[PDB]
Design an enzyme around this catalytic site. Sequence first.
Site, PDB file in Angstrom:
ATOM      1  CG  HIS A 199     -51.405 -20.963  60.284  1.00 36.38           C
ATOM      2  ND1 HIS A 199     -52.319 -21.037  61.314  1.00 36.38           N
ATOM      3  CD2 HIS A 199     -50.929 -19.696  60.295  1.00 36.38           C
ATOM      4  CE1 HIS A 199     -52.393 -19.865  61.920  1.00 36.38           C
ATOM      5  NE2 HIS A 199     -51.559 -19.033  61.321  1.00 36.38           N
ATOM      6  CE  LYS A 221     -55.061 -18.559  58.353  1.00 35.21           C
ATOM      7  NZ  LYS A 221     -54.865 -18.085  59.743  1.00 35.21           N
ATOM      8  CG  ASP A 230     -66.625 -19.454  39.398  1.00 35.49           C
ATOM      9  OD1 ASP A 230     -67.166 -20.472  39.881  1.00 35.49           O
ATOM     10  OD2 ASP A 230     -67.215 -18.358  39.284  1.00 35.49           O
ATOM     11  CG  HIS A 283     -54.839 -13.455  62.404  1.00 33.67           C
ATOM     12  ND1 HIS A 283     -55.248 -14.045  61.227  1.00 33.67           N
ATOM     13  CD2 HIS A 283     -54.269 -14.441  63.136  1.00 33.67           C
ATOM     14  CE1 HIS A 283     -54.937 -15.329  61.248  1.00 33.67           C
ATOM     15  NE2 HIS A 283     -54.341 -15.595  62.396  1.00 33.67           N
TER      16      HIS A 283
END
Lengths: 392, 392
Positions: free
Chosen positions: A116, A118, A123, A325
């Site tokens: 789950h 994210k 860089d 969300h």
Amino acid sequence: CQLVLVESIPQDLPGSPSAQPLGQAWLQLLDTAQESVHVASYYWSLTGPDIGVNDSSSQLGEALLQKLQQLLGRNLAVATSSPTLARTSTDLQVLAARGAHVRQVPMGRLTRGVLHSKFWVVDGRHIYMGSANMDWRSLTQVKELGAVIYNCSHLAQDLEKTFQTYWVLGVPKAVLPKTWPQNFSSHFNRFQPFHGPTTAYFSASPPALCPQGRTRDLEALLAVMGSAQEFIYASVMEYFPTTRFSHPPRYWPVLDNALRAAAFGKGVRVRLLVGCGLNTDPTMFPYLRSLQALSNPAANVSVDVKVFIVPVGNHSNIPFSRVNHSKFMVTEKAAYIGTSNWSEDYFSSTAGVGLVVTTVQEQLRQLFERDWSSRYAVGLDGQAPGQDCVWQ
Amino acid sequence: CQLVLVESIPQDLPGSPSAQPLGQAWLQLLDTAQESVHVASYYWSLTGPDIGVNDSSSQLGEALLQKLQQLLGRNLAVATSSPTLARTSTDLQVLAARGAHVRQVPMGRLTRGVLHSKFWVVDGRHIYMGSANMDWRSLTQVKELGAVIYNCSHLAQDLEKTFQTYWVLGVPKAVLPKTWPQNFSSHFNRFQPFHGVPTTAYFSASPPALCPQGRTRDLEALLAVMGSAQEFIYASVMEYFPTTRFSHPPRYWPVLDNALRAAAFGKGVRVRLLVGCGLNTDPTMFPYLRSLQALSNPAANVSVDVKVFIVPVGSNIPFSRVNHSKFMVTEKAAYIGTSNWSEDYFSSTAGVGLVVTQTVQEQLRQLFERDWSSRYAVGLDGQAPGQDCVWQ
């Protein structure tokens, strides 16, 4: 060293405090990239043709897609996925055929669960982490909250090591290592956070994916709630003091017990805002009432709960949208942002990450207040025939 | 081996199932005595002048009192008390001047607490267990429940061990031993219970500091009974607090609550909780009860029901007219105890508890059903204008 909170706002949501739009921050991230991007994403629905396309809300999504190609035109996109959703999508296939190295960890193989998490590390010097997974709906058609950090390169890798934990798994015949070597070991846990005028640290979950020096997301949440002394602001799409998707269902009170302990033993005023999006579980509602019933101003116990219902309007085109969300919490000391909802799985089976930092607390303070005194936040008894969530 | 449950019912009306009257069974017990009686009591107030009230319902009380002298006239009484209530009473002095050995355990000095245990072991072979302490109000003007056992001596010495713990701490300047010798060690815990009657049974003590080797603490006994429950749980305690009491820093305490909700959710167990309502109860208790009642959801096989037992005054008699009974029964076993359900009774205050299993459990089933599906039990949302309990 800079850190900015980012917000994705769909149709409506009106003088109120505001945050930086997330789409520009993503363009930002892909623009600053010079060498490499490392991606941890639950699923990938970014092009639109994977789903219905005649809404015209989609551009913010695939415009973003072109930026990805720029990094592949400049010569390394590194993505990691899960037992994924929206399998019809061909984004990962396109990027792999275009030069992106992608492996997916089948977290169900290892711990019955899912990835789950994210987050981005770009860089090795910039990071993004928030509730917005790989979805254009997360860019224009669902409320999202997150945080992005630039310059602070000495901390930017601090989520990369986890990203790299995910990276090492997902190889064929992969096995859980009982001990991660010093390569994946972390030195930036809750006991020693970062320095620079804030202090911050990251946390991972589940324990099997936590190397030495990694604080578990559960422990981070518990510590943040314990350190609270005046207020606890919690905004998660779903809140279940129970285990989900486990063959024998079992109760799980630790988060709930800590909430109630903060409210009672330290008099902390706590407000809990949970999302309602036509797909929520009505069974969630009694537990919330069970929290709301604790409220008693005469005994210095302050527990208030509301539900955030966002209207579908003329946008019933998008099926898996029109929800809150965002997942976060703030106390007068700290600000926690997370990728996981509040249920047992996210702390026993499914991968998740969480940042906690310490005016930014006041910024999220005012964000939650705008999201709380709003008209779309309603109390438990506001059935409202015109409202659009399932309550029973 | 015989066991009889005894119930004290004031001037109230229950065609309904009934139990053996407590006064006549207690007189029975003092009659059967031939050598010795050992008494653990919270306080001693059995005559009217002990609390200065002119009610003829006290006569039965003093009748029992007179029986004590007969036993001391027949040649022995041993009593142990606490930082006791109703200090104006002179009963203990009366029995002491006639041959009764009394020492007071200063439980406030040692464990913040009081001796809340109420039991007798007579002749080393018969026992009494209950919520009824030494009070004539406990004979005629308050609901009480207990259990008495005859001819089953192998458990009588197991309670004599706890009595002797109280005895040894009753010496002046007594200090809690960090290790109880083998004399006080018990061999009849929950793991190996006892084996006339085809039953199995065991005792439990509290707090841990007064629990010698082999003794399960009352907290563990309650938790085990609720965990073993598979179809229902009847709980009836005068007060129920998922919090500490008389504790200088107040803290939350979810252990019993978590079990009640874990049993309700994870195993579909039907849960009913009956708490007493009086002119002296704490109104702050009511929100927590709602927290249980809000759990109710017939669509998810979770059954949590709460009612309050209010008996009407008619008062002249102070600190009476309440439901002082504490017990719980599941389709397997029946626990009856002396302590209410709050943290103090399991960390600071002395308590004891019997639990038996095999018809006696079914006996308690319909006894509670007569009290739940009853006349004096009302739901949380009723709060009828005329009865005498505090709601705010």
